[PDB]
Amino acid sequence: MAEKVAVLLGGTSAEREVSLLSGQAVLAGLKEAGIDAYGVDTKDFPVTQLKEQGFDKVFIALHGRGGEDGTLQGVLEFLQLPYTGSGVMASALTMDKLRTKLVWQALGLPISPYVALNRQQFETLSPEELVACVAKLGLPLIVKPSHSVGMSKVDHASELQKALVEAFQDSDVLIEKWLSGPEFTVAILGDEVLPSIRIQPPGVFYDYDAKLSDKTQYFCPSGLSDESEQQLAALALQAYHALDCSGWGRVDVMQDRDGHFYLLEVNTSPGMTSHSLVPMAARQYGLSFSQLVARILMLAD
């Protein structure tokens, strides 16, 4: 009657090497807690066989494509295996920055002003009236695809059309007001919000590249005043529930010059390396790594 637990790790995404390390750390925390867990490198073993192999429960320590995007969660729902983190809808929805924003926006949650663009709209429109479309956003701006890659900063209009030809490779592209920073991240564990962490990237984007730079620095405590922390904590929780997330995740948020926070995204299978954000926040919150993973596992049912 004790559960056999698959720790899914590695995979075939560009984040494979981080995921190897996450799943390795998860596996050893689970074993420390006395969980009957086993490493499963999904690159070499088909996720569709987990049930055949005797597993009762899955801890997902994969990242990126096929790990945090709904596809693996559908496999697990098909097999009727319980698993960690968010379900099919939320896992997928969180990869789509346009629909994430629209949900948050319809709930009145704060996001930076923006304009989205289809293809049959990119094509239609004159470069010149593309800048009228965005003028109301002021300057500077960020231009990015809706699903990093093709991401770009813009300082005045002449520069815009270039960034827009990059981007459409991707029927949806986003054009938003540039925010000053700093950037913060808020880990969530079940219903509990963990201490926020301020992120300084080695200069401009905290993109995929700055998640293999040994430069990026995290601060926890973040340095926010007590009141700013409570507002950020309540906001992150709202943003997470807004998208139907469960188990655990990480909400990323950006301050602007006005001092207010703006929601960027929710990550539904965060890094779990000893150097990673959720473990960092969890330690500051008073949990050991091992307790953290035992608790994530308990939040799967």
Ligand X SMILES: Nc1ncnc2c1ncn2[C@@H]1O[C@H](COP(=O)(O)OP(=O)(O)O)[C@@H](O)[C@H]1O
Q: Which is nearer to ligand X, 59 or 114 (CB)?
A: 114
Nearest distance in Å: CB 258, Na ion: 6
Nearest distance in Å: CB 33, Na ion: 26
Q: Which is nearer to Na ion, 90 or 142 (CB)?
A: 90
Residue 176 binds ligand X (CB under 6 A): yes
Residue 170 binds a second copy (CB under 8 A): no
Which residue minimizes CB distance to ligand X?
206
Residue 68 binds Na ion (CB under 5 A): yes
Residue 183 binds ligand X (CB under 6 A): yes
264 binds, among a second copy, ligand X, Na ion, none (CB under 5 to 8 A by kind): ligand X
Q: Which is nearer to ligand X, 254 or 292 (CB)?
A: 254
Cis peptide, bond prior to residue 221, ω within 30 of zero: yes
Contact set with a second copy (CB under 8 A):
47-48, 66, 69-75, 77-79, 88-89, 92-93, 95-96, 99, 101-103, 105-107, 118, 241-244
